[PDB]
Amino acid sequence: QEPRTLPPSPNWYCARCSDAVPGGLFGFAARTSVFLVRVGPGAGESPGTPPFRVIGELVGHTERVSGFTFSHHPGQYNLCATSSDDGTVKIWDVETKTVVTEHALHQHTISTLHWSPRVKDLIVSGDEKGVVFCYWFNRNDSQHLFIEPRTIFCLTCSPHHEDLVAIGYKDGIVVIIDISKKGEVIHRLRGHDDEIHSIAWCPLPGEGCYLATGSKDQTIRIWSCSRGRGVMILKLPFLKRRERLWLTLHWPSNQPTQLVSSCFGGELLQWDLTQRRKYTLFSASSEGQNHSRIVFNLCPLQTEDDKQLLLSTSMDRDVKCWDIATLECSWTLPSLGGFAYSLAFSSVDIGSLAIGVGDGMIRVWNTLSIKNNYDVKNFWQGVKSKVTALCWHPTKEGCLAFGTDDGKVGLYDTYSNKPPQISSTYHKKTVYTLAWGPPVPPMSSLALYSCGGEGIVLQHNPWKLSGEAFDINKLIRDTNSIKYKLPVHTEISWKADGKIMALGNEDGSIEIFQIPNLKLICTIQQHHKLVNTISWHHEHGSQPELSYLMASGSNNAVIYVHNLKTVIESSPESPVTITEPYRTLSGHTAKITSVAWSPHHDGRLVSASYDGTAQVWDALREEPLCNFRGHQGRLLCVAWSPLDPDCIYSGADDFCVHKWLTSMQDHSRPPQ
RNA sequence: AUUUUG
Angstrom distance (rounded) from CA A337 to CA A335: 7
- Of all nucleotides in the shown strands, which has a C1' nearest the CA of A29? B3
- The distance (Å) linking the CA of A429 with the C1' of B5 is 11
Rg (CA), chain A: 28
- State the residue range of the domain holding A457: 330-672
Total domains present in chain A: 2
- Report the alpha-carbon distance of residue A88 to residue A83 in Å, rounded: 6
Go through A392-402 and write b for each residue having 16 or more CB atoms within 10 A of its CB, e for each that does not: bbbeeebbbbb
Q: Which strand ranges, in their side-by-side order, compose the sheet holding A623-628?
A: A592-597, A604-609, A614-618, A623-628
What is the distance in angstroms measured between the alpha-carbon CA of A26 and the sugar C1' of B5?
34
Interatomic distance A246 CA / B2 C1' (Å)? 16
The distance (Å) linking the CA of A656 with the C1' of B1 is 22
CA distance A202 to A300: 15
List, comma-separated, the residues after which chain A is broken, a break being a C to N distance over 2.5 A; otherwise answer none: 207, 242, 275, 444
Among the listed residues A427, A520, A521, A531, the one whose alpha carbon sits nearest the alpha carbon of residue A477 = A520
A544 CA to B6 C1', in Å?
Answer: 31
DSSP state of A456: P
Q: Kindly provide the b/e burial profile for residues A98-110, where b requires at least 16 CB atoms within 10 angstroms of the residue's own CB.
A: ebeebbebbeebb
The answer to whether the bond into A266 is cis (omega within 30° of 0) is: no
Question: Do A638 and A596 contact (CB within 8 A), yes or no?
Answer: yes
Q: How far is CA A579 from CA A286, A510, A605, in A?
A: 63, 11, 21
**Distance of A131 CA from B3 C1′ (whole Å):** 26
* Residue A464 CB coordination number (10 Å): 12
Question: Whose CA is nearest the C1' atom of nucleotide B3?
Answer: A31
Q: Are residues A316 and A368 in the same domain?
A: no
Specify whether the CB–CB gap between A513 and A498 falls below 8 A.
no
Between CA A535 and CA A605 the distance in angstroms is 10
Protein CA at A14 to nucleotide C1' at B2, angstroms: 13
Check if the beta carbon of residue A307 is closer than 8 Å to that of residue A323.
yes
CB A502 within 8 A of CB A515: no
Neighbours of A170 (CB within 10 A): 17
CA–C1' span, A405 to B5, in Å? 9
- With distances taken from each CA to the C1' atom of nucleotide B2, the closest residue turns out to be A337
Do residues A311 and A356 both lie within one domain? no
What single letter denotes the amino acid at residue A672?
Q
Nearest nucleotide by C1' position to the A359 CA atom: B2
Same domain, yes or no: A25 and A63: yes
How far is residue A140 from each of residues A79, A81, A121, measured CA to CA in Å?
16, 15, 10
Distance of alpha carbon A384 from alpha carbon A577, whole angstroms: 43
For A564, list phi and psi in degrees, rounded to 5.
Answer: -100, 15
- C1'-nearest nucleotide to the CA of A389: B6
The H or E element spanning position A473 is helix A473-480
3-state secondary structure of A482: coil
Strand B positions with any atom < 7 Å from protein CB? 1-6
Give the end of a domain, one of A275, A306, A329.
Answer: A329
The sign of the CA dihedral A558, A563, A568, A570 is negative
> Please, which residues have CB within 8 angstroms of residue A640's CB and are 6 or more apart in sequence?
A596, A597, A598, A599, A600, A606, A647, A648, A649
Spatial strand order in the sheet of A352-357: A340-345, A352-357, A362-366, A376-379
What type of residue is A390? L
Same domain for A229 and A358, yes or no, is no
User: How many CA atoms lie within 13 Å of A81's alpha carbon, on the beta-carbon side?
Assistant: 27
Resolution (A): 1.8
List C-alpha distances in Å: A454 to A320, A391, A406, A490, A505. 42, 20, 12, 8, 11
Element (H, E) at A476: helix A473-480
Residue of A170, A167, A259 whose CA lies nearest to A222: A259
> Using the 8-state DSSP alphabet, how is residue A662 labeled?
G
Q: ∠ CA(A652), CA(A655), CA(A656), 5° rounding?
A: 70
Contacts of A332 (CB under 8 A, 6+ apart): A289, A318, A319, A320, A321, A374
For residues A372 and A4, the answer to whether their CB atoms sit within 8 Å is no
Q: Which of A282, A308, A329 is where one domain is finished?
A: A329
Q: How far apart are CA A453 and CA A666, in angstroms?
A: 37
Closest CA to A482 of A491, A474, A490: A474
Q: What number of other Cβ atoms are within 10 A of residue A480's Cβ?
A: 18
DSSP letter at A477 equals: H
Strands A399-404 and A229-235: unpaired
Which among A251, A101, A85, A109 has a CA at the least distance from the CA of A166?
A251
CB A603 within 8 Å of CB A619: yes
Q: What is the CATH number of the domain that holds A605?
A: 2.130.10.10
- How distant, in Å, are the alpha carbons of A352, A436, A456 from that of A448? 20, 5, 14
Name the nucleotide with the smallest C1'–CA separation from A432: B6
Of A283, A303, A329, the last residue of a domain is: A329
Are A333 and A318 within 8 A, CB to CB? yes
A454 and A494 belong to one structural domain: yes
CA A122 to chain centre: 33
- Same domain flag for A514 and A569: yes
Residues 6+ positions from A506 with CB-CB distance below 8 Å: A455, A487, A488, A489, A490, A530, A531
Nearest nt to A31, CA vs C1'?
A: B3
Query: Secondary structure of chain A: what % helix, strand, coil (to 5)?
Result: 5, 45, 50
- Round to whole Å and give the CA distance between A638 and A642: 12
- Closest nucleotide relative to residue A455's CA, C1' based: B6
Q: What b/e string do you get for A118-140 counting C-beta neighbours within 10 Å, with b at 16 or more?
A: ebebbbbbbbeebbbbbbebeee
- How is A543-596 classified by DSSP, letter by letter? SGGGGGEEEEEESSS-EEEEE-HHHHHT--SSPEEE-S-SEEE---SS-EEEEE
DSSP states of A101-131:
EEE----S-EEEEEE-SSSTTEEEEEETTSE
Closest nucleotide to A453: CA versus each C1': B6
User: d(Cα A606, Cα A364) in Å, to the nearest integer?
Assistant: 22
C-alpha A54/C-alpha A38 separation (Å) is: 6
**Whole-angstrom distance, CA of residue A396 vs CA of residue A202:** 57
Residues A325 and A430 in one domain: no
Q: Phi-psi bin for A48: left (phi > 0), alpha (psi -120 to 50), beta?
A: left
Structural determination approach: X-ray
Residues A447, A628: Cα–Cα separation, whole Å? 36
A196 and A335 housed in the same domain: no
Cβ-count burial A184-220 (b if 16+ within 10 Å, e if not): eebbebebbebbbbbbbbbeeeeeebbbbbbbbbbbb
DSSP letters for A397-420: TTEEEEEETTS-EEEEETTS-SPP
Under 8 Å CB-to-CB from A475, ≥6 apart: which residues? A440, A441, A442, A517, A518
Q: What's the CA A603/C1' B2 distance, rounded, in angstroms?
A: 42
Q: Compute the distance between CA of residue A625 and CA of residue A144 in angstroms, rounded to an integer.
A: 55
Amino acid at A590: A
Distances (CA, A) of A413 to A110, A346, A363, A401, A410: 45, 13, 13, 9, 10
Per residue, the 3-state secondary structure of A521-541, as one string, reads: EEEECCCCCCEEEEEECCCCC
Q: Using CA of residue A113, residue A115, residue A118, residue A124, what is the dihedral sign?
A: positive
C-alpha A480/C-alpha A477 separation (Å) is 5
Handedness of CA A307, A313, A316, A319 (dihedral sign): positive
Please tell me the total number of residues recorded for chain A in this structure: 672
Picking from A330, A349, A339, A442, the residue whose alpha carbon sits closest to that of residue A392 is: A349
First to last CA, chain A: 30
- The pair phi, psi for residue A548, each rounded to 5°, is -90, 0
Nearest-nucleotide field for A317 (CA, C1'):
B2
The answer to whether residues A236 and A218 touch, using CB atoms and an 8 Å cutoff, is: yes
- Among A136, A142, A143, A102, which Cα is nearest to A121's? A136
Strand A657-661 to A647-652 pairing? antiparallel
Residues A559, A586: Cα–Cα separation, whole Å: 6
CB A425, CB A451: distance < 8 Å: no
A379 with A299, same domain? no
How many whole angstroms separate alpha carbon A86 and alpha carbon A269? 35
Strand B-proximal protein residues, Cβ less than 7 Å: A 8-9, 11-13, 30-31, 64, 243-244, 337-339, 341, 357-359, 386, 388, 405, 430, 432-433, 451, 453, 490-491, 504, 530-533, 591, 593, 636, 655
**A45 neighbors A303 (Cβ within 8 angstroms):** no
Judgement on whether residues A325 and A415 belong to the same structural domain of the protein: no
Same domain (yes/no): A445, A323: no
Minimum CA–C1' distance nucleotide for A555: B6
Q: Which residues contact A142 (CB under 8 A, 6 or more apart)?
A: A103, A105, A133, A134, A135, A136
Q: Are residues A325 and A351 in the same domain?
A: no
* Cα–Cα dist A204/A210, whole Å: 9
Query: Measuring CA to CA, which residue among A81, A73, A100 is closest to residue A19?
Result: A81
Q: Calculate the angstrom distance between C1' of B2 and CA of A540.
A: 44
CA of A217 to C1' of B4 (A): 34
Whether the Cβ atoms of residue A577 and residue A611 lie closer than 8 Å to each other: no
Distance CA A331, CA A310 (A): 11
Is A387:A356 a contact under the CB 8 Å cutoff? yes
| Residues A433, A387: Cα–Cα separation, whole Å | 11
What's the one-letter identity of residue A61? Answer: H
CA atoms within 13 A on the CB side of A427: 31
CA A473, C1' B2: Å apart? 39
Q: Is the dihedral of CA A415, A416, A417, A422 positive or negative?
A: negative
List phi, psi (to 5°) of A644.
-110, 115
Q: Do the Cβ atoms of A258 and A286 come closer than 8 Å?
A: no
